């Protein structure tokens, strides 16, 4: 029973412009069907109408993938990812219906980005900025059956370094971010903490 599916730091505010950080790719275990994801994004907490996010997943069989998403509208897999790579992730919201997502593997020199525009079926409020480790869901075709994927164990800790959030061009500190942890079977399965411009999340 997954009681909390997000672990990480969430800032609440207004006019969030860009959210970016560099995260390391961990090794994962627990089975080919166990997984986890690390991503940076805008909205999706107190703003339930949309979320601009980009990041990567790890599966217990040692495989990975990268993606971007403007929920609920455009969602898709982006670059090659290997254990130990350093991935710079970033989203920018130029308006409630326009922005971009960029994922750069600083280790391989590969980079992908997607520009979004005229996003109708779901606009941003630009009131939440976040750095998250998540136990995501797997749904069938018609949303009639959605379930959380078994959460993979990972090592070392996934650290979002050089975190940067801006609101109206002004940079915002992580000082007052709310902290959440992934919780399964009434047990914390992450220990995410903030320190300076770093959000560090250890698997528990």
């Amino acid at each position: 029973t997954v009681e909390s599916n997000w672990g990480g730091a969430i800032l609440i505010g207004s006019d969030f412009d860009t959210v970016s950080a560099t995260a390391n790719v961990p090794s994962a275990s627990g089975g080919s069907s166990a997984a986890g994801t690390a991503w940076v994004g805008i909205d999706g907490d107190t703003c339930q109408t949309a979320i601009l996010q980009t990041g990567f997943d790890w599966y217990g069989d040692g495989t990975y993938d990268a993606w971007y998403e403007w929920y609920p509208e455009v969602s898709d897999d982006f670059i090659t990812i290997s254990e130990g790579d350093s991935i710079q992730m970033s989203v920018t919201a130029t308006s409630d219906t326009s922005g971009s997502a960029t994922l750069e593997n600083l280790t391989t020199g590969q980079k992908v980005s997607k520009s979004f525009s005229n996003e109708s079926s779901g606009s941003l409020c630009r009131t939440n900025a976040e750095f998250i480790i998540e136990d995501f869901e797997e749904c069938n075709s018609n949303g009639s059956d959605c379930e959380f994927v078994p959460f993979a164990s990972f090592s070392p800790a996934v650290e979002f370094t050089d975190c940067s959030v801006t609101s109206d061009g002004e940079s915002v500190s992580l000082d007052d971010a709310q902290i959440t942890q992934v919780i399964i079977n009434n047990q914390d399965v992450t220990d995410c903490s903030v320190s300076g411009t770093t959000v560090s999340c250890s698997y528990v």
Binding site: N5, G44, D45, Q48, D57, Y71, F136, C139, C146
Partner: peptide, 7 residues
């Protein structure tokens, strides 16, 4: 499909 989802 993968529902990477609201908090």
């Amino acid at each position: 499909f993968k529902f990477x989802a609201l908090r």
